[PDB]
Design a protein around this nucleic acid. Sequence first.
DNA 1: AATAAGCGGATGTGGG
DNA 2: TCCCACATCCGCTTA
Length: 91
Amino acid sequence: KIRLYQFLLDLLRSGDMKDSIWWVDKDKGTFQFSSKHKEALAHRWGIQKGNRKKMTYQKMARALRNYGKTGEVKKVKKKLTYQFSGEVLGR
DNA sequence: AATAAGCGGATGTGGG
DNA sequence: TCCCACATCCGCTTA
Ligand code: NA
């Protein structure tokens, strides 16, 4: 199954949910979720994974926090903003 | 208060 | 066995 950081990177490349997520500085890998439309994107993640329960932005962000150590995605000190690692962007 | 984002420990589930 | 890569639950903190 596709990994969460890859799901998000794929969405940013396709632009299929442009109203839910967007690049801030794509060269730096920084991206931001929509305050009002992030739940629709979270729902899509859960359906793609076939999880038992409805996915929520809160649970999706809890999963993102677990990348902080290994570095695939880091939280930026801006609202709803995150940053992919160079390695993630390179692949 | 109402609303929202942030934080993260503890535990449960998948598929190796 | 026991790690992977989250999912889920819960409560606290900050704005
Ligand atoms: Na929020």
